[PDB]
Amino acid sequence: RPVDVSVSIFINKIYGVNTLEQTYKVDGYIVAQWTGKPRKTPGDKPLIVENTQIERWINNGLWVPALEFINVVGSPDTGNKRLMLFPDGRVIYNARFLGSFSNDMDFRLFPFDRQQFVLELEPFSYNNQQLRFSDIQVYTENIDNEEIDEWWIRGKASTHISDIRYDHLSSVQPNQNEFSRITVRIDAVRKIGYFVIQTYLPCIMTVILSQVSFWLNRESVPARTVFGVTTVLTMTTLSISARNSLPKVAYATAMDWFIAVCYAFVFSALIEFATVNYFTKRGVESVSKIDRLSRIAFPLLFGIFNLVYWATYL
Amino acid sequence: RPVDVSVSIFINKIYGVNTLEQTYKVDGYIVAQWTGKPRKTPGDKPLIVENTQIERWINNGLWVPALEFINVVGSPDTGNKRLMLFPDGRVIYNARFLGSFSNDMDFRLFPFDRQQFVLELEPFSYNNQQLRFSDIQVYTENIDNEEIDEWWIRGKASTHISDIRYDHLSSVQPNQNEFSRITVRIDAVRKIGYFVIQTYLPCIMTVILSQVSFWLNRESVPARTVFGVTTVLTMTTLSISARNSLPKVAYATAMDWFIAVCYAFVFSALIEFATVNYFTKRGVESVSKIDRLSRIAFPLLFGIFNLVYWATYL
Amino acid sequence: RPVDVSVSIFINKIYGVNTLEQTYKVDGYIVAQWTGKPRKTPGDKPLIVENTQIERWINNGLWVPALEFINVVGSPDTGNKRLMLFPDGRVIYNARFLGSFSNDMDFRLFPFDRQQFVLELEPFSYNNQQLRFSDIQVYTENIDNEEIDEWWIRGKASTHISDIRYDHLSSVQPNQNEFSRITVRIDAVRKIGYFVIQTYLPCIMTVILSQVSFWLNRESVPARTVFGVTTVLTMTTLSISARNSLPKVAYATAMDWFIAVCYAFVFSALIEFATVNYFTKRGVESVSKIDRLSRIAFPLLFGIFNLVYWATYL
Amino acid sequence: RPVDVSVSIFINKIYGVNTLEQTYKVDGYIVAQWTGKPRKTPGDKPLIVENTQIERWINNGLWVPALEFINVVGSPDTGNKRLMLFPDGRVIYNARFLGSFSNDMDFRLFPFDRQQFVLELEPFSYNNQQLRFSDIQVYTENIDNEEIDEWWIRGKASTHISDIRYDHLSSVQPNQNEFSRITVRIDAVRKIGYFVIQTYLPCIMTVILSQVSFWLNRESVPARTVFGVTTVLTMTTLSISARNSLPKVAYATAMDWFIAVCYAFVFSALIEFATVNYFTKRGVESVSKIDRLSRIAFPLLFGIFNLVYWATYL
Amino acid sequence: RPVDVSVSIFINKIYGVNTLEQTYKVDGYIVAQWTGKPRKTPGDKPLIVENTQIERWINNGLWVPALEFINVVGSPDTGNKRLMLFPDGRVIYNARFLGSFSNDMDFRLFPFDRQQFVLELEPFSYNNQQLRFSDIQVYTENIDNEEIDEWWIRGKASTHISDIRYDHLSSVQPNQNEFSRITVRIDAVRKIGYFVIQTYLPCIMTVILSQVSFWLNRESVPARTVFGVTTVLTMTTLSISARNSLPKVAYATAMDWFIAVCYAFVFSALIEFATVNYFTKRGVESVSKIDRLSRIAFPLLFGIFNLVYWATYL
Ligand SMILES: CC(=O)[C@H]1CC[C@H]2[C@@H]3CC[C@H]4C[C@H](O)CC[C@]4(C)[C@H]3C(=O)C[C@]12C
Ligand SMILES: CC(=O)[C@H]1CC[C@H]2[C@@H]3CC[C@H]4C[C@H](O)CC[C@]4(C)[C@H]3C(=O)C[C@]12C
Ligand SMILES: CC(=O)[C@H]1CC[C@H]2[C@@H]3CC[C@H]4C[C@H](O)CC[C@]4(C)[C@H]3C(=O)C[C@]12C
Ligand SMILES: CC(=O)[C@H]1CC[C@H]2[C@@H]3CC[C@H]4C[C@H](O)CC[C@]4(C)[C@H]3C(=O)C[C@]12C
Ligand SMILES: CC(=O)[C@H]1CC[C@H]2[C@@H]3CC[C@H]4C[C@H](O)CC[C@]4(C)[C@H]3C(=O)C[C@]12C
């Protein structure tokens, strides 16, 4: 007695990925097919009914169940609606949907993170005892496979049919509070190219600039201080601007750890000079022993770190 | 004589918390049940009517009271609507809502503040003598309890039913102008991580950078002045950029007072040096005992301050 | 014969004040009551008609005039609509409105300006010979009077009813082209707290920083120049950023005049040092009497200026 | 035989002028009058039909032509619609329109440019052989002439009626593809106040700051270089921030030409100083006559430049 | 047997080009003509039916196929709709559309890139066996083919009719899953004027400013370091700010390569100075012949680069 419903979804385009609001817009077509009671169409041809004329048919008792996207931010922009009325009884609901979808996202591996563009479809007013999803096949490719859209699509779609228990229907439907839900997931990874130029490389070149102070002398204090404060302030601002593209989360990202280390070498380089200025009297010949090793200690310490960093997270 | 109305609300997700406009977006379901006049349904099953077809029923005299969200910023995004028509008379109104809600917020303890995500539900056109809310049940935790949405959810929801007197309905029914209101509150706390990295740490290291001037000498005036002006201006920009994440309120926040203190230590450090620069010839051997104590007075005075700060506000 | 219309407006909240666009958002309820032909309702109770069911009544010749907000930025967000049909004949139209309103604003006294949140209500299609507004009652205080909205509400509402002559209907209604207009005004004053921290204090501490150049010496020219250019440029950036919260108006504001002075003292301080640097050899012993007096002349001129400033504008 | 249609347009307000998108919002009323078949109204008074009830009238065969704004960005925000049915036959369509309009704008004389706020009105589905505009009257002044937000309304309105030939209807209407078009233009001039405060004066004072380097000496190279690099970079950023209030046009504006000159004097001052530093020993007694003459050439050239500039462009 | 449909599209204006979201807004009219079943119109004149009155015709069984824009971001802003019903059977659907369209764009040649503003029109519910596009005519030139605001339109439109195979109808339409698709392309080139003034010229003069350091001496280290760090940091910010007008793509643009080169000359000049500072005692006469030659090597190396750069990419 539960209505077996076959569902096919074609994803036309994915766009408007917003990491801040954790939303992403999905455009495509939807198809809902179920075998109902036979009817006599005008002619043996299948009857096709478009947007407005569908209302007159449900007014004559036609059964069209409302389907609902769960992980959506607002009522999706529904396009044109059509109805395929076959003589053997099978009904086919086809329409285009453009909605702003949401999904929980973890940024602990920013910007090397992997996230899932998920579609959560599930009917309304009809539980698993009344309406059941037979199968789901997502014909996303032939368009999707173009993955130069600010992300990298890795793998095909994943379809799964599950049963969700809503407790807020228990007061009204005893033991009838489970709904069949279709879930479609597409794994994707981020493209680190944009962030290398905005934060990573500016962090590196700032570190390179910060360490030039070692190679000057016990020279004009203005010079080695200007090198210090400019690199510290520059590294300070980059630490701020690097998170403006991220939600106000608590955990630290791989970009955060990279900045803190790059912050350390920059701040240490200044204190190193500030150290030899208090020890300008204890052991001064032409150059101290700190600079003679800091000119090599700092770059090598920083160099191997980048090797550990980029070898990881990749 | 007033109709007892049982209300159940299932919150799908809370998102889009905007501290500036003091809004927050809430998605979820609503259930409204009342006992009406008995009817003879087609079959013994309860009759289920979906979005558009409900309008035809109220045209035949069916009574569906309009419910209204008070603390909303604009007309909420109403999803799919359904009606459960039982033969014994009881009617059940179930629909999905996605709205931008508002609530009075106090920012005196920024960013350690506690706020409440509130839903204020109340009917339209029907007072408490005509329509009464029997009970309210919020089955929010099942989903909501995952709070990585820029805030920290601490505790379950609190439900309360009250009666509100609108004076602008006195003109039509004297003394019968009170409306039943359902109120749903969810306490929440902020995640200070983003603010630690964006303002607090940059303020601290700037203060740390400001105090390196002490450990130099009565040295090149350019150096110790560059330390002064850069740190003062840096602290000045941070004082401004720290408030762009807040509405144009009048009272000062815990972040504000914390910056003013960090502002004091930076400006005092410059004047401290600017003082010893006025005494460069009267009593100069190597160090002004002022600097010899400022190298210890400033960190300890600032160090104990952070202990006074973080012990408070927590 | 003109229909006397009683109007009551309940303001739920005023929010979203945008000084740039000179708009402001207003949420609340509206009530329009007029005496029609008597009828016999079902029971002596008043007949209540909700959103959609109004269509059936107005199609049957019921007279429900549409009321129109003049000073609105776009088509207001109409909430739920209701109709109270009384048996004694009086008809009552009640609905909730959320609209983005506009009003001409003068910003010559930024941020000490006084502005008016105005509602200009007036019907459509019905002149004063056909429809006249009897009285207006603004039930704003019950909620509004808690002035926590980036502004301070100073006083209750002020109502004015007038007759407006539209010349573009003279070609169609000779001498019958006057419309009854309801006007609701709420005076308000601005909260200078946000601007004290963003512009005033950074301007002041910059001026304080600008004068430290005097207390150095005829010293290292780099230092007193670094004090000079940084303070001028800092004051220049603050002079620009201070108007980004204002429309691109022509007249100068009280904040503008205050900055120009703060710009003058800072730029004068640099020119002063550049002057004593031109007199570095002709008449040099230890200090130019200019510095001996500028350390007192400038603060006294600056001190009395702020006192004259804040005594005014308040 | 073509239907003569009298048109009256009342402009309520012009607001939201965006120079970047070259759009502008116009709110007001519209009146369309044509003489139809006589009718018998209830009483000799004209019959008035409001927003929804018009649909029933056009459903009964009444001829109400849809009017269309050409230079609009999206479907304009249509307010309330009314219908005046006169007994002598003349029909009057009156409604309120709030739309975001567009017009080609030339910015070669930024910020002294002159622009026109244009309304291009033209019917749909009815050509000039079917519908013709008799006359047009724009009752704009009553309100409009008060402009306080970035522009100056200078002069009255200009009305013109024309016939436009669309070639894309020849396939559907051979030789009958011309539509009557109403065009309303309002000249306006820009208010340079905002730009004087944001760029022009800051450009001037920066140029003034650039020339103080002359009055120092062949002095501490840090000072006169700090004068050089800081002024060059400051003038560089102002050239950037000056165009963010403009679309990405190709031609250079009067503000651009003004900045390029101000850019030259700033960079020339550095090269001038950098020149005398290359000649510090070959022909040195006390001062390089270059600075002694640059102190007069530079201010006079800049002063006379503003005279050539501001005598023009005004 | 498939209905041949003639389609004409008139593009009124192209506006709102957003390179970030890769969208662009298109306003214009559409004409769809097909020869249908003969009918008896009132009079021999063609019957004209406007927006609302069309619904009654399709309600009486008239066949109006829904047409669909593929490369659209959301449900487009549909204007006024009209229907021409001819007695010989031919039906004509004419309407105005304003939609936000999208197209894949390649930014490797920023800002010398050439892009295509594409419209993808294709019907719904009717395959190529039922509805076929006979021909397409784009009458765009009348208001185009000259140039647009931020881009240059070069050439007339390009028309393409194709057959698109959707695999998601195979389960419901075996071998009948091909749709006729009209595609309209407009080639366009970018206007580099805005980018020359905003990034290129500031990058060039910054390199020029960086090279003045050579012409000082083995002089005050503060000066040549101030030249060094300021130019390096300035060039660093320009590398970031130049990409804020681009999506987060992975590939590097022609603007990126130009900045990286400009980054080298600035950074190389600093290392060059940092080299001669290491040789202040080891091989010192007055100047390191490196600086004596770098004053010629760098400009010529930079000069020839600009010739290679701008000769390319054009
Ligand atoms: C012997 C030595 O190398 C000296 C030279 C500079 C000094 C530091 C300067 C900045 C100081 C800020 C605050 O006073 C805390 C302490 C702080 C980090 C100092 C020290 O630990 C001692 C340092 C490192
Ligand atoms: C004698 C001495 O060592 C000098 C060095 C720095 C000087 C201060 C700099 C800032 C000044 C601002 C305004 O002129 C009021 C006075 C003000 C606070 C100065 C003084 O108290 C005197 C100081 C402490
Ligand atoms: C003798 C003396 O005290 C010198 C020190 C600073 C100099 C001024 C610096 C700013 C200059 C701007 C422009 O070059 C015009 C001239 C301008 C006002 C200079 C002077 O007239 C001479 C001044 C006042
Ligand atoms: C002899 C003289 O006074 C020197 C001092 C500063 C020098 C200029 C500084 C900027 C240089 C940029 C690039 O290195 C090309 C060359 C460039 C324009 C120099 C010159 O032609 C020679 C100048 C004017
Ligand atoms: C021999 C010579 O001319 C010196 C002058 C400047 C020095 C360089 C400055 C920047 C340094 C950054 C980090 O310390 C790694 C090493 C780094 C590249 C230095 C060196 O290789 C040695 C240089 C080239």
Author numbering:
A (entry chain B), B (entry chain A), C (entry chain E), D (entry chain D), E (entry chain C): 10 to 199, 222 to 316, 388 to 416
Recite the paper's sentences.
Alphaxalone (5α-pregnan-3α-ol-11,20 dione) is a potent neurosteroid anesthetic. The structure of the α1GABAAR chimera co-crystallized with alphaxalone shows that alphaxalone binds to five equivalent inter-subunit sites close to the intracellular end of the α1GABAAR TMD. Residues within 4-Å of alphaxalone are from TM3 of the principal subunit (A305, T306, Y309, and F310) and from TM1 (Q242, V243, W246) and TM4 (P401) of the neighboring complementary subunit. The aromatic ring of the conserved residue W246 is parallel to the C ring of alphaxalone, establishing a ring stacking interaction that potentially stabilizes the binding. The pore profile of the α1GABAAR chimera desensitized by alphaxalone is similar to the pore profile of the apo chimera, except that the most constricted pore is located at P253 (−2′) in the desensitized structure. Relative to the aligned structure of the apo ELIC-α1GABAAR, the alphaxalone-bound structure shows 1.3° inward and 0.18° outward radial tilt from the pore axes in the ECD and TMD, respectively. The alphaxalone-bound structure shows a small counterclockwise twist (0.80°) of the ECD and a clockwise twist (1.37°) of the TMD around the pore axis. Alphaxalone binding to the bottom of the TMD introduces structural changes, including the orientation of W246 in the TM1, presumably to optimize its interaction with alphaxalone. The change passes to the TM1–TM2 linker and further to the TM2, particularly at P253 (−2′) and V257 (2′), resulting in a backbone RMSD of 0.95 Å for the residues covering from W246 in TM1 to V257 (2′) in TM2. The structural changes further propagate up to the ECD–TMD interface and other ECD regions, as evidenced by the observed RMSDs: 0.66 Å for the TM2–TM3 loop (P278-T284), 0.61 Å for the pre-TM1 (R199-I223), 0.58 Å for the β1–β2 linker (V26-E30), 0.63 Å for the Cys-loop (N112-F126), 1.01 Å for loop A (N80-S84), and 0.84 Å for loop C (D172-N186).
Type A γ-aminobutyric acid receptors (GABAARs) control neuronal excitability and are the primary inhibitory pentameric ligand-gated ion channels (pLGICs) in the central nervous system. GABAAR-mediated inhibition of neuronal excitability results from membrane hyperpolarization due to Cl− flux upon GABAAR activation, which can be triggered by binding of the neurotransmitter GABA to the orthosteric site in the extracellular domain (ECD) or allosteric binding of endogenous neuroactive steroids. Here, we report crystal structures of an α1GABAAR chimera in the apo state and in an alphaxalone-bound desensitized state. The final residue R199 in the ECD of ELIC was fused with the first residue K222 in the TMD of human α1GABAAR.
